Amino acid sequence: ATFEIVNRCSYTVWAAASKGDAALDAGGRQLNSGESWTINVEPGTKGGKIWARTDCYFDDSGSGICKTGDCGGLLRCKRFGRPPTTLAEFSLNQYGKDYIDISNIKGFNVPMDFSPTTRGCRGVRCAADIVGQCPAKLKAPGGGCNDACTVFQTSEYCCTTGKCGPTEYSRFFKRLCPDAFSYVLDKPTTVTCPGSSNYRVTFCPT
Ligand SMILES: NC[C@H]1O[C@H](O[C@H]2[C@H](O)[C@@H](O)[C@H](N)C[C@@H]2N)[C@H](N)[C@@H](O)[C@@H]1O
């Protein structure tokens, strides 16, 4: 499957793509304002994620640091990134279907639209100003708005026992972006697309 990743933000981001134990395609790249990066993701990829990173510094060996979304100091991510990170999530070719969603379960750093470029399903978007409105206890100094699990590390916020409800903090994310997961047991906002669809991820879509 093809994913086109487009940075429409006025600032540079460093895109990342990983299925947790491995890079997807090159795994990461700098995207200046307006740049597009096209990657190929193997059919059958389960649990893939794409996100943006802000305020990164890398040396010539592709090693360094980012203020949001850092994946152990690497330009090319092999693993998932440190919150806060707005997440485009996907599982491809699962019994003939693709499943896509956007999630704020790991917080929010950059607004995002996640849309199919082929026929047969709709896209999802979280483009509200979550950072500007972020509750004070969730504000990350580096930028972005952390989820409550990352900040407080309780069973209720992390949904550790498999049982948990919504919270004042989850409802904040849900109010600004109803189409994104706001906590682990949120009512699914997953979208079902035809198997082997293609997609575009746009940072700062509006
Ligand atoms: N709070 C301190 C610890 O956890 C943080 O966040 C984790 C974060 O909890 C994971 O969900 C993420 N995938 C990686 C990230 N390292 C920090 N990134 C690390 O400093 C440390 O692992």
Side-chain angles (χ1 to χ4, degrees), residues 19-166:
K19 57 192 282 285
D21 60 355
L24 297 182
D25 198 285
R29 220 201 80 178
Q30 181 169 329
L31 292 180
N32 296 145
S33 182
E35 297 193 319
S36 302
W37 177 36
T38 293
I39 63 169
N40 257 267
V41 175
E42 174 128 318
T45 297
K46 172 76 199 290
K49 301 190 198 296
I50 285 159
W51 68 104
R53 299 169 284 172
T54 53
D55 299 308
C56 301
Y57 295 87
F58 296 110
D59 65 20
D60 294 314
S61 70
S63 171
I65 189 153
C66 300
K67 295 232 236 270
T68 68
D70 188 75
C71 57
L74 300 182
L75 173 57
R76 304 174 169 189
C77 298
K78 286 184 185 74
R79 65 171 184 78
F80 295 142
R82 163 171 168 165
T85 52
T86 319
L87 293 172
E89 306 179 310
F90 47 92
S91 289
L92 309 177
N93 305 290
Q94 301 302 301
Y95 303 100
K97 299 303 196 186
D98 286 359
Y99 296 98
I100 67 168
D101 68 80
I102 292 179
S103 172
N104 291 138
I105 289 167
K106 299 296 201 197
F108 175 103
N109 60 340
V110 174
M112 165 188 291
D113 179 278
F114 184 10
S115 289
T117 53
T118 50
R119 54 182 301 181
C121 51
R122 71 186 179 97
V124 283
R125 180 176 292 208
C126 174
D129 187 18
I130 284 171
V131 182
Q133 296 304 345
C134 186
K137 299 202 171 158
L138 303 180
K139 281 152 99 56
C145 189
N146 286 311
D147 66 284
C149 171
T150 298
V151 175
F152 293 104
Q153 293 280 278
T154 70
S155 299
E156 192 62 19
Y157 297 137
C158 303
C159 209
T160 306
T161 69
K163 290 167 188 206
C164 63

